[PDB]
Structures are given as C-alpha cells and as structure tokens.
C-alpha cells in the first residue's frame, strides 16, 4: 500500500484551509472520495443515465446493468449468498429503521426483549425505542467493561429466552471498540433471537464476511467507505427478508396492483420502492472496486498502524484523556483536561486540521463516560503518521495557549 | 429559449445508439442532466465534502451551507413560506409514504375515507391501500371522464364529510392530464380533508406555487427535473408537519436521547434521520438554478408547442390510438393498432429512439383504458420538433414493417 499514490487519487486532500495544508481527520463522520468514484458518477450522467428495469432501450439497459451489477459487487464484497439478500437503501440509518419497522414491529409482543448496548449510535437506539413502545416489548442494555468493551459473560446475562432481537455495533464510532459479533450472534441464536449488526464503521475499514459472522441483518453506509452520499445497504438472511413485509410501498416493488390490494415483487426489489438511487449505487460499486484493489486487509493493517501510533503519541501529552480500549479501529476520542472539546476543534481548524467535537450521536455513551462532549480524530486509508504528528503538536499548543490565556486573566 | 444552446449543455444527448443519433423521448421515466448539475456534484466531492450540521471545521461549514442553501432554493422554487416545510427525501415515492405513515396512519379511523383517482401512479396508490388497511378506513376512487380528465362534479360527489385525505396527481405520467388541483384543494378543505399532491410530473415542467394551490402536502423527485437520482422533496404545511411524528428515527433528527425515551429536533430536521443526501440535494439546488435561469414559463410554453405538434402528427398516422385529452403536458401515450407496444419500443430503439412500453406504474389506469400495455414518448426542454418527426416517421415504418411481416407469413 503506497500512501502517496493513494492520496494522489483524492483531489479534495490537496488544498489549504486558513493558510495551512488541510489535515482531514474526520473520516468517521464521512470519508473523502477518489477520482475512480467521482468519475464513475460523471460517466453515468454524461453517458448512460436512464430509468432501470425496463430495458426496452439501449441506455435503459446500460443503466439497469450498472445498477444490478453494483448489487452483485456488494454481495461479493460482504460475502452474502445471494443478491436477494442485498437491499439498496439511503444509508445505515434507513436500513436499521427498515428492520425495526418490518421485522421488530411484526414480531414483538409484551414480554419480548430487544437487547442493545450502551455504546450504540442513535441510529441503532431510537428505532428500537420506538419499536418496543409500539409493541409493549422491553428494551435492555448490555453493560460495558471499564475500558469500553463488552464481555461475552455480560451478553449471556442480558440476553434471555425472552430476547427476540440483539442489535449491536460492529465497531464503535466513539470508543473504536471492535465488538465480538460472531460470538454474540451465537449467543443470540442460542436464545432464540436474531442479531442486527450496525456495520457503518466496520465496513469501510475491514473485511466483512456475513457468512462467517452469521449475522441475521447487517447495515452499512456508502458515504463512510469512499462512496457517494445518500446510499447504503441492508443485508438480511434471505429466509428472514422473505417473511418480512415491505417498509415502503409504490412502483417498482409491486407485481400486481388492483384498486384495493397489491402483490409484491420477489427480493430484493420487494424492498426498493420507487425509482432507485441509481447513480449512487453504481458509485458505491466503484468504491468497492477501489477498496478491493488496495485490499481491505492492507487498509486494516494501515489503520491499526495509525491507531497504535496515535495512542502512543496521545500518551505523550499531559492532561489528555483517551476513551476506550487499546485494541481498536482507526479513531481516538479524547478530551483536553482544561479545554472544552468545541474550543479544541475550533483551534485545530485554524491550523488546517479537521476533527469533530460533540456527542457523536451517542448520548447514552457520553453519560456512561460521565462527560457532556468529546473531540474525535479519525483516520482512513489516505491519512499518515505525519498528519498524526500535526494533530498532537496542535493539541500541545492548544494546551499551552489556553494555559497562557488563563494565566493572563489570572494576573488581570 | 434557444434549443440548440440548451442541448449543448447535456453531454449525454450527443451520441449514437445502433448507428443512429440518439433521440431520447423518455424524460417522463427520468430526465437527463446539464453540465451545471454534474459539475456541481463534481465540485462538491472534489472540494468541500464533509458531514453537515456540526460546523466546527471549514469543509463541514461549507457542506452545511451548501445543503441548507439548497433547501432555501427549493423553498423559493415552489413558493413555500418556510424552510421548515421543506423536507429532503429519497424521492416522490418516499415523500408520499411518509405522509401515509406519519399523517394517514395517525389520523384514520373506521368510517374515514381516503379518496384517490383512477389515473394515479402506484406511488400514490399503494401507500394509501396500506394505510387504510392498517386503520380500517375506506379507499375511494374519483371516476374519470372519457377523455381522461377529472370533473369537479365527480370530485364533489366522491369526497364527503367522512373524507380525511384526497391524494391526486398534479400531472398524469400517462394521459398528460393536468389536474385542477387548486379547485380540488378547495373541495377537500370544504369537507374537512387535507389534499396530498403528487407533483413528480408537474414540478419539472411548470411553475409550482404551493400558496396558490393551497395543497397540504406536495411531493416531487429530483431525477425528473434535471437533478441527481436518489433525492426528492416532501413539502407540507408547517402546522401539519409540526403535529406529525417522524417516519424514521436516528441521529440528526433527535434533540435529547435517554435510554428509553428521546425528544425530536424542530422542523425540518425532525424528518431527516441519519447523514443526509448531501451531494444530491446540492445538485438538485443546481438543477433549480438551471431551470430558473431558462424560465419555467418558457419551458412550459416549449412543452406545449411540442405536445401540440406531436398530437397533430400522431393524428396523421393511421391505426394509432392516443390516450388522454387534447390539453396536456409534454407526453403522448399510444398504441399501434396491430403491434404490441414492447415491439414498437424495440424497433424504435434500433432507430436510436428511446421511448417506454408497459403499464407506466398505472395498472388501474391501464384497466380503465381497457389495454394491457401502451408505449409512451415524453418530451422535455432539450427535445425538438425534428425529434418528433423522427418518431412519427419510425412509427409509420414500424406499421409498414409489421404489415409486411404479416403479409409474408400470410403468403407462406
């Protein structure tokens, strides 16, 4: 993996902000795109845009072959058995809501449990809150260990023979924890439950094999993995999808339409109502081709290297707290002892560096961490150790600067 | 309006299919895009992509200003009072489903009616079928007149003081009928109902003024109006949206998240769960700037000219039936007396011409028309009379060809 030649493919990295070279360390909020993806959307709209799944005219055939061709690329990318298990959606959030609406709301009764964890993103909390309220079921939380991991003993304790759904992140967007999904799926199935995996922050960064994980549902977003905004996937085991009703209704997902009653198409199109996200899905197939050509294992080793370098260099700073475990994905959430993380983020942007400050869509986790907000630097396949050095040098200067501001006002 | 200079802006028109200059007459299925739109998406991904609504870092601020800036462009484009009434969705189909889920399902009881028409597209049928089934309400159909228009007397007869929702197309994608929405909204409101307008085929082609129409909800799709795929709008009167609950749940549309209960953001963001369709919405704002610079009234006059020319030249062919009224939008659905419309579409594609054959997502309408399928040529701001002449000349040759095929087999 040559990081110079990879960075050359991402036009947006080559610019200055506030007079300094951009240092983009916010890929956990969204990733940047290589030319191969942007030029895929260009070539679609410049040469073969048309509506799909009619194939009476030549451009229509080419658009349809692009769109279903991309569905096959996703199937092979996550090792699904069939394209029937691959649904294109607008993003992870919509994919999880479809499961909560079509699966959970059809299958929960009073006394049933949905089990989640305290580290979940809101996309994998609020749909379950709503589904259990709609059905009179109960929502339970798997507790965390002190370093922000999950122990399988806690899983076994929380999940019971009344659990019907366990929903959990593959990778935490805040702690960087990689959760033991494969062993949790075994525990769910032993108790009679399905497991719903929020793979938004694992898919961009490491190989996904849904046959090895044995997850019942898996959700991911294109915009975090070098692909266009506005598109995502829901994977579900074919036997579950076949029994779920659609979450949305319209043209394209019907077979017969009478005045009062309609029948649906087969999978996957039963779950794709209306003209689909044609360009975006073709662009996501290009992003997959791009990542596969570098190699997901190479990208994960690069990210492990950056994350171990970041953790070490953060330990060199005084007065900085890092949250979560030592073994982790490519991100670091942290606070400076005496500075609000929003002020940290503002000062860093003045030195060209882009990070995030806030709750990162994990309010229950911030409460668990006993903080009201954090800052987060996150890394991807275009980032380098020199960019981490710029980060830690700017945090040091931030620390000194706010110290000096304090001291002047002290004197005053 | 200069059609040569407009066509110069659409790279995809300049190519051959099967050795003939492309003649794209399928813009009612999806429209083509000018350089100003495609280059808007390019410049987004090349220069300022980042996640929106944090604004701690410079690219994040620029993306957010692009995305909310586009929301304002849509507000002014349909003459909504506020950006709170403008929700970005994945397309008209999703917008109508949100109304059916958040409005109809919350407000229908046994004895309530939802009134639609026989000419509706499936996107504006199936969500209502499902909502009335979920609530035990009743679905009723406004009948059509023999030329495929709706009379207001039939509206008045069908809508009663038990009607709670009337849902109707602004423009039919099959008959080309422009429905009297403003007078139907008055009839709905007189009976205590709201009106839901499917504006997918009117918005690209004619000025929309939701204050003049007084529609309660109005839905449209970007990909039919020169903009990117995968994005649409739902407009709703602010007082209705404020009382509806969200249709999807997640990050971005919350204010507070506890373990079991959450509170929502204000409008419009209450209805936009998850990372939004950032590039596509910015591209749709570019499409609006593009259409406004030509002038929607100029585009509608061009389309009236093409439609009157097409209807006249179709009347010159023997053995061709055109469905719908004389006063119409820029499309013609038709059949050749002795040829299946799928064979018509195939032969035309061999001469470079792209049209559609099928039910056009209006099965109840095809049953009303007593046909199993039709062909449809549809026109937009890049099409010309010479392209209509090529169409009618190819239909003539199709007619002769199938006649001769018949005659050879007769002889044989």
From Swiss-Prot, chains A, B:
Q: How is the activity of this chain controlled?
A: A Cys to Ala mutation in SufU (Cys-41-Ala) has been described to be a competivie inhibitor of SufS activity and a non-competitive inhibitor.
Its Enzyme Commission number? 2.8.1.7
One GO molecular-function entry: cysteine desulfurase activity
Q: Which UniProt keywords apply?
A: Pyridoxal phosphate, Transferase
Q: Which reaction does it catalyse?
A: (sulfur carrier)-H + L-cysteine = (sulfur carrier)-SH + L-alanine
Q: Which Pfam families match?
A: Aminotran_5
The alphabetized list of GO BP terms reads: cysteine metabolic process
- Catalytic residues (UniProt): 361 (cysteine persulfide intermediate)
Q: Which organism is it from?
A: Bacillus subtilis (strain 168)
Cofactor(s) for this protein?
pyridoxal 5'-phosphate
Q: Which InterPro entries match?
A: Aminotrans_V_dom, Aminotrans_V_PyrdxlP_BS, Cys_dSase_SufS, Cysteine_dSase, PyrdxlP-dep_Trfase, PyrdxlP-dep_Trfase_major, PyrdxlP-dep_Trfase_small
**PROSITE patterns linked:** AA_TRANSFER_CLASS_5
Stated name of the protein? Cysteine desulfurase SufS
Q: Which domain of life is it from?
A: Bacteria
Quaternary context: Homodimer. Interacts with SufU; this interaction induces an opening of the active site pocket of SufS. Interacts with frataxin/Fra.
């Amino acid at each position: 993996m040559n990081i110079t030649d990879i960075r050359e493919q991402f036009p947006i990295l080559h610019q200055q902000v506030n007079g300094h070279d951009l240092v983009y360390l916010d890929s956990a909020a969204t990733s940047q795109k290589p030319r191969a993806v942007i030029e895929t959307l260009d070539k679609y709209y410049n040469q073969y845009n048309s509506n799909v799944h009619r194939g009476v005219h030549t451009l229509g055939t080419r658009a349809t072959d692009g769109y279903e061709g991309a569905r096959e690329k996703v199937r092979k990318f996550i090792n699904a058995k069939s394209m029937a298990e691959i649904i294109f959606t607008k993003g992870t959030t919509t994919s999880l809501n479809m499961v909560a609406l079509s699966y959970a709301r059809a299958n929960l009764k009073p006394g049933d449990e949905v089990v989640i964890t305290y580290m979940e993103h809101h996309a994998n909390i609020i749909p379950w809150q709503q589904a259990v309220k709609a059905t009179g079921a109960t929502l339970k939380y798997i507790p965390l260990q002190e370093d922000g991991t999950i122990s399988l003993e806690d899983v076994r304790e929380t999940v019971t023979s009344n659990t019907k759904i366990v929903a959990v992140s593959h990778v935490s967007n805040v702690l960087g924890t990689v959760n033991p999904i494969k062993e949790m799926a075994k525990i769910a199935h032993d108790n009679g439950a399905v497991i719903v995996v929020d793979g938004a922050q694992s898919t961009p960064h490491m190989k996904i094999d849904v046959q090895d994980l044995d997850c019942d549902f898996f959700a991911l977003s294109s915009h975090k993995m070098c692909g266009p905004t506005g598109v995502g996937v829901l994977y579900g085991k074919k036997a579950l999808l076949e029994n779920m009703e659609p979450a949305e209704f319209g043209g394209e997902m019907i077979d017969f339409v009478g005045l009062y009653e309609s029948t649906w198409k087969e999978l996957p199109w039963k779950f794709e109502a209306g003209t689909p996200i044609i360009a975006g899905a073709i662009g996501l197939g290009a992003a997959i081709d791009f990542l596969e050509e570098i190699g997901l294992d190479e990208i994960s080793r690069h990210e492990h290297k950056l994350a171990a370098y970041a953790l070490e260099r953060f330990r060199q700073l005084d007065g900085v707290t890092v949250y979560g475990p030592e073994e982790r994905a490519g991100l670091v959430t942290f606070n400076l002892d005496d500075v609000h993380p929003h002020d940290v983020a503002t000062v860093l942007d003045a030195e060209g560096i882009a990070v995030r400050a806030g709750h990162h869509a994990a309010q229950p986790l911030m409460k668990w961490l006993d903080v009201t907000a954090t800052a987060r630097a996150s890394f991807y396949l275009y980032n380098t150790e020199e960019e981490i050095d710029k980060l830690v040098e700017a945090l040091q200067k931030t620390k000194e600067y706010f110290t000096n501001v304090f001291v002047d006002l002290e004197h005053h």
